[PDB]
């Protein structure tokens, strides 16, 4: 399920994201030895945290947003969040004729584009596999012919089976709405709803 944004629903301009906050949550056990050497240990997973802020909402905008959020809380679905700043179209073509060799469980994807894709991905972009909902950021990219060497920040959450297909454009965050236990919005005497905030967390 997609969170309402002024792409799908421009008739409600108040539903735009006044300010997004992409939080990097990678819990680690960091210990500082007296000999000046700082040591880290990583066990848990990394999850992208998204915080959405909203302006004053008119009754119709709030009605639409609240209906969507209640539909989410009813069906227990997953809110999809689209960040416009990450929607630069660089890689274009078909992602079905590209092959990803299997057995890749590290933090690096080696894929043979088979000359079917034009353009090259840029570092810091958003990358995602077609069979897993986790979202990756490209930290480095080296192309030697048709084989690409894409480096990802989160260690690969799945081991490639050879059937996965890279996804570069149209990437959505399969988030789950936090702070929904006590979710409310005050209605002022002037008819507009205020104090609406969405603390979302990537529940892959």
């Amino acid at each position: 399920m997609r969170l309402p944004d002024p792409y799908t629903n421009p008739e409600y301009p108040g539903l735009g994201f006044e300010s997004v906050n992409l939080v990097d949550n990678d819990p680690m056990i960091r210990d500082e030895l007296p000999n000046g050497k700082v040591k880290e240990v990583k066990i848990s997973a990394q999850y992208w945290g998204i915080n959405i802020s909203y302006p004053e909402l008119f009754p119709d905008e709030y009605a639409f947003l609240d209906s969507r959020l209640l539909e989410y809380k009813r069906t227990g679905d997953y809110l999809d969040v689209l960040l416009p700043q990450y929607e630069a179209f660089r890689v274009r073509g078909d992602t079905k004729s590209v092959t990803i060799p299997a057995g890749q469980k590290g933090s690096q994807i080696i894929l043979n584009t088979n000359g079917t894709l034009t353009g090259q991905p840029k570092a810091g972009d958003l990358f995602k596999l077609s069979t897993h909902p986790k979202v990756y950021k490209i930290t480095n990219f080296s192309s030697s012919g048709n084989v690409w060497n894409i480096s990802l920040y989160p260690d690969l959450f799945i081991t490639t089976t050879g059937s996965e297909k890279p996804v570069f454009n149209g990437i959505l965050f399969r988030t789950k709405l936090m702070n929904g236990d006590s979710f409310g919005s005050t209605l002022n005497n002037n008819g507009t709803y205020s104090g609406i905030s969405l603390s979302l967390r990537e529940s892959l």
Partner: protein
């Protein structure tokens, strides 16, 4: 001693315990994930320059392993003299058989 019946072995063990009682001083500290494999009763040489310690002999007494790669240790001070055996004498002539509990013949 319950399980010891040899007089000289029991005397040696008592001497060892008496020597070992003179080293009553314990030390506790934590080490990183490296040094993994420490177990109780292992020889460790401690060296803390602030004290007058340079390769001081210790034996592991308590070891605790955590899942976040930290090992808590408690060392027990020992000495070299604990394991050398002092000369003893023979008690061979001080045996007392129980020749009682029976009627002596005429």
């Amino acid at each position: 001693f319950a399980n010891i019946t040899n007089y000289y072995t029991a005397r040696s063990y008592a001497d060892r315990e008496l020597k070992k009682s003179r080293y009553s001083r314990t030390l506790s500290f934590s080490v990183p994930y490296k040094f993994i494999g420490i177990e109780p009763n292992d020889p460790i040489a401690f060296t803390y320059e602030r004290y007058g310690w340079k390769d001081k002999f210790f034996l592991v007494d308590e070891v605790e392993n955590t899942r976040d790669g930290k090992i808590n240790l408690v060392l027990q001070e020992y000495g070299e003299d604990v394991f050398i055996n002092s000369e003893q004498v023979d008690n061979s002539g001080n045996d007392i058989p129980d020749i009682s509990n029976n009627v002596l013949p005429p």
